[PDB]
């Protein structure tokens, strides 16, 4: 049964609620982004209207084979009427095609559902600026002050400089980047661009990337592994065993691997500056864990909410424990008292 925090009161609408069977009273199912915990349950046999972004709709059609007649893509930043209710989709600064949804209820209540997001001050000048929000359904993934990480731009700078140094010292080094879903494409695209290479990958991953409307993509990616010195592999293969095995396959073209694991936050964030990050090394293989996040830090989350001033907050992440819930409610009250709403 569908939980309360996936239902939008006063509507026929649910958000990211595909794993519950037919939800009683739901006339339209919204999907915020193409990540598995959110799309869980969709397939080619789904027969209810799905509302999402163009990019999310490309992935639904090509990867999950959802039939075209049930896919309803909406443009961003545009007032649209769905089953008699005004909605707007906003960029969520998460993975490609990820959105926030603004719902303008018939009784005058305004609701913002963030989906998954990385809050940014640029959101303070979207169509959110123009009106009041009564209820906020919030991505609270990192809602605790120990969760700090750098900007995405500093992390990319670290990775570009790292890769460029290694390969200029040894032109026979291979770079490998881990992946297990969409998002974080800047990591491997920025590295390949500094090295003057395309990024090589499996047919299944190339297909996924072809759905993302990324400009000039045919210039950046390829299925010909032999022609590329930046390879993508499944995240589970980013370990000494998996990389040794991969090095075997390259036919003595390479004699060293430098590999990157983009993670979210890890406890080495509580001690180490991005500048000071070092790899784990075994022989001719090194592995860097880099803190490339597509969710708000605690400070970024706080700034957004204190700007928005919602009347009520409903968390969508970390909802399963009482300790989590009590922690989050404490921070929301702090934020409200400090800012004065
Ligand atoms: Ni996500």
Swiss-Prot record:
Biological process annotations from GO: cell division; double-strand break repair via nonhomologous end joining; interstrand cross-link repair
Known outcome of mutating residue 139 to N: Impaired nuclear focus formation, reduced interaction with PIAS and increased sensitivity to cisplatin
UniProt keywords, alphabetically: Cell cycle, Cell division, DNA damage, DNA repair, Hydrolase, Isopeptide bond, Metal-binding, Mitosis, Nucleus, Phosphoprotein, Ubl conjugation, Zinc, Zinc-finger
Induction (free text): During mitosis. The mRNA encoding this protein contains an internal ribosome entry site (IRES) in its 5'-UTR. This 5'-UTR generally suppresses translation while specifically promoting expression during mitosis, when cap-dependent translation may be impaired.
UniProt note on tissues of expression: Expressed in brain, heart, kidney, liver, pancreas, placenta and skeletal muscle.
Disulfide bonds: none
GO terms, molecular function: 5'-3' DNA exonuclease activity; beta-lactamase activity; damaged DNA binding; zinc ion binding
GO cellular component terms listed in the entry, alphabetical order: fibrillar center; nucleoplasm
Subcellular location: Nucleus
The protein's assembly and partners: Binds constitutively to TP53BP1. Binds CDC27, which is itself a component of the anaphase promoting complex (APC). Binds PIAS1.
Function: May be required for DNA interstrand cross-link repair. Also required for checkpoint mediated cell cycle arrest in early prophase in response to mitotic spindle poisons. Possesses beta-lactamase activity, catalyzing the hydrolysis of penicillin G and nitrocefin. Exhibits no activity towards other beta-lactam antibiotic classes including cephalosporins (cefotaxime) and carbapenems (imipenem).
Family under the similarity heading: Belongs to the DNA repair metallo-beta-lactamase (DRMBL) family.
Protein name (record): DNA cross-link repair 1A protein
Species of provenance: Homo sapiens (Human)
Lineage, top ranks: Eukaryota, Metazoa, Chordata, Craniata, Vertebrata
Gene coding for it: DCLRE1A
Full-protein interval shown: 700 to 1040 of 1040
């Amino acid at each position: 049964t569908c939980p309360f925090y996936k239902k939008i009161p006063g509507t026929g609408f649910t958000v990211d609620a595909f794993q519950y069977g037919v939800v009683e009273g739901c006339t339209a199912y919204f999907l915020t982004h193409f990540h598995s915990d959110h799309y869980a349950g969709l397939s080619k046999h789904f027969t209810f209207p799905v509302y999402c972004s163009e990019i999310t709709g490309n992935l639904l059609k090509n990867k999950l084979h959802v039939q075209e007649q049930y896919i309803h893509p909406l443009p961003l930043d545009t007032e649209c009427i769905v089953n008699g209710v005004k909605v707007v989709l906003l960029d969520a600064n998460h993975c490609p095609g990820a959105v926030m949804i603004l719902f303008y209820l018939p009784n005058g209540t305004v609701i913002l559902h963030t989906g998954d997001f990385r809050a940014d001050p640029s959101m303070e000048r979207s169509l959110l600026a123009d009106q009041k929000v009564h209820m906020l359904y919030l991505d609270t993934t990192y809602c605790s002050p120990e969760y700090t990480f750098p900007s995405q731009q500093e992390v990319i700078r670290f990775a570009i400089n790292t890769a460029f140094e290694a390969v200029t010292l040894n032109p026979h080094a291979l770079v490998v980047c881990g992946t297990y879903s969409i998002g974080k494409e800047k990591v491997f695209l920025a590295i390949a661009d500094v090295l003057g290479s395309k990024v090589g990958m499996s047919q299944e991953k190339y297909k996924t990337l072809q759905c993302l409307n990324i400009p000039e993509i045919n210039s950046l990616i390829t299925t010909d592994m032999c022609s590329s010195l930046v390879h993508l592999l499944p995240m589970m293969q980013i370990n000494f065993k998996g990389l040794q095995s991969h090095l075997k396959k390259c036919g003595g073209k390479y004699n060293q691997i430098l590999a990157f694991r983009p993670t979210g936050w890890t406890h080495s964030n509580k001690f180490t500056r991005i500048a000071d990050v070092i790899p784990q090394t075994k022989g001719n293989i090194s592995i860097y864990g880099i803190p490339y996040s597509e969710h708000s830090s605690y400070l970024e989350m706080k700034r957004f909410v204190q700007w928005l001033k919602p009347q009520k907050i409903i968390p969508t992440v970390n909802v399963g424990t009482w300790k989590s819930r009590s922690t989050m409610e404490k921070y929301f009250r702090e934020w409200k008292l400090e800012a004065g709403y």
